[PDB]
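G., before I forget:
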Amino acid sequence: ATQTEILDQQLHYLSCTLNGGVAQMVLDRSDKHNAFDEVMISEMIQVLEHFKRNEQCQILLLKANGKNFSAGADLNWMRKQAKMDFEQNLADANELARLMSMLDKFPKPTITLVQGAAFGGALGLICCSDIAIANERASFCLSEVKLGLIPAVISPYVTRAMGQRAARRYMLTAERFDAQKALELQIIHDINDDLDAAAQPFIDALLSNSPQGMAWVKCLLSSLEDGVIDQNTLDHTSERIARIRVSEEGQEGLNAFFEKRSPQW
Amino acid sequence: ATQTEILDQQLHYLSCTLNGGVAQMVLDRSDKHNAFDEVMISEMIQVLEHFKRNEQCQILLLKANGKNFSAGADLNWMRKQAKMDFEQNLADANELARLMSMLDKFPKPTITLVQGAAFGGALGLICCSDIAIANERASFCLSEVKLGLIPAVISPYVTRAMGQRAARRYMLTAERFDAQKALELQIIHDINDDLDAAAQPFIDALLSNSPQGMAWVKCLLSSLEDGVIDQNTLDHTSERIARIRVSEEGQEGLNAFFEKRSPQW
Amino acid sequence: ATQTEILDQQLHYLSCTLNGGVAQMVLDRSDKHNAFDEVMISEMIQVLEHFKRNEQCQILLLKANGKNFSAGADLNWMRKQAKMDFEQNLADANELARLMSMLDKFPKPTITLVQGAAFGGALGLICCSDIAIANERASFCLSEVKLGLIPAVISPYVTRAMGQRAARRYMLTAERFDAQKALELQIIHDINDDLDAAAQPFIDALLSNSPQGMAWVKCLLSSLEDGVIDQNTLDHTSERIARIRVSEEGQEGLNAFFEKRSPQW
């Protein structure tokens, strides 16, 4: 039994599997609508740290069992938060923030597959993923202001995805929105009732490409998030390309192409 | 007679009314195409400062009488600007800049309803609003470069809304664009010939939600405009959610939901 | 024979012409699919520096001969890069970076017309142009990670155009995308099999407008790229409008309009 198989068995709310390059993290609490609580949050951190270490993981796929991806926040968990003081609340929030950050920075391509409702922190995960595909019934909602709250921890990622113009509407109205609108706003990349068929071509493309190059694409895009294009941007982009090209991995990618053979990454 | 009714009577170019949570600022100079001059600018500042203070204002709705929202800049006003020296021009611009800033930062949801032409500073207002709905004949144009000018004061807001890729086209061509293109670029959120029916569902959603939470959504989105997502972003978002949750308002929103009752905000 | 006619004759890979306000830079290496190498890069720099100086150039149009805009990077050039050490690579990259920067900052409206494939650095040029029109067969691809590389030098411009949400997909998958998707992502502004007819209305609009005002629109949009809207943004936008208005050019644009005559720019 592998470390993944052991973790899969010990996690309460998640499954996790690893086969042929592709790791999966699966929301496996359908009986409670995959609703988030402190345990789900923590289990997701653990699975992420597990697969980041793992050399056999080229891609991380996030999915969920049941009809709904997450109905968002567990009511019992919400009652507990309500009784918390500032500092306990801050610690909770910081763990949810650590979850989003580690996903967003995961040094490997991530694909999220979203069926039905994806409410609450789930939208953050989707916005933290590099590729997201939802089914036609997929449902979204930024509801916090209905409860005197705000979606603070997910807002940086959600705003990056959908933009300020749309965030200022949807975060203030707390209206529901559908799959097609999601697609337009670029919350998702594709709509397909067969989420497995829809993911295949992305998985195929991603397993073919340079692990190092994909990790560097991600740090590079990270460095550009601020929108600045000045001398330092120019110097840094030029240094990145020059470095990878002389790297072993850069060198192997080029040689494989010249020699018309498959790269051994 | 209320302070609003008195202001409504004294303003030359605007109307203003207040009923049932909803304040309205209405461009009421149809005879001159709601064209902006120094007086319009100043009256709009006054109405904004009036409703920001007002505790009975949960939402601010901006609308205009006549067939056109604003044909943009008053010709007589333009002749005056032409004769101005640098410093007089700077003062004008700073007042227009103070108008946009105060609207953009207004701590309450704003909805703009745009019929026909919305030229000149009107586009800035629309880009400063949280929700904008236009009719099918709505017309837009960034014309300044046709006159050896630039739309400098509105550009930050307009750029935020439509993005750099589209700003660099439309600000350089000065071409007219239509409602549908507006919608695609996200200058507007909805298209409907019945602007009143179109606003209703947004008004209903907005009056239901936490005034404090909506104000905090707006400051938070403001803080994220730069695109940076670093340690401080993480610390600040975590501090915001923790704070509101323990607030009276946060607490009341949560309790109302647990108790399955309406929040008394 | 003009300086342009002389340059046109001496360039190996480009043509260049100048007529009636409109300068053209033309990729003229169809036999090798307009593929980029060090010489193409350098020739493009020279043509840009040539037309920036030129007072008879109001607009710069970029186009290409043959069926394909650029198949991207020349294989012979790639073999050379592979053998380069860090510092030689850095110099290459810095020249490609200097090319994109000078185009992006060119103080005059640029229009790019893209037929078929536009792979590699070509996408950067397109993303550096103010207006881009492609035909229905136009093809795009960010392929670098297939070779253990990254599109580092073009990424700032490409990211500005299409956004982070889409960059993180396409830069990681290295998938091909088509004209329509390009249009949606705003990589292009229009789709038309008749690229010459499609450019005409933009050329007409651009030759009519203030050269100074268009140059200032561009610096101003540049200054706003970071997304910050603070006191200094406000002060700087107000100073720009006040300055141009009192300028000779500002003054002439206004007077021509008041006098219902054509501006003599």
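The longest helix of chain C spans residues 86-104. The two ends of chain C are 27 Å apart (CA to CA).

More on Monday.
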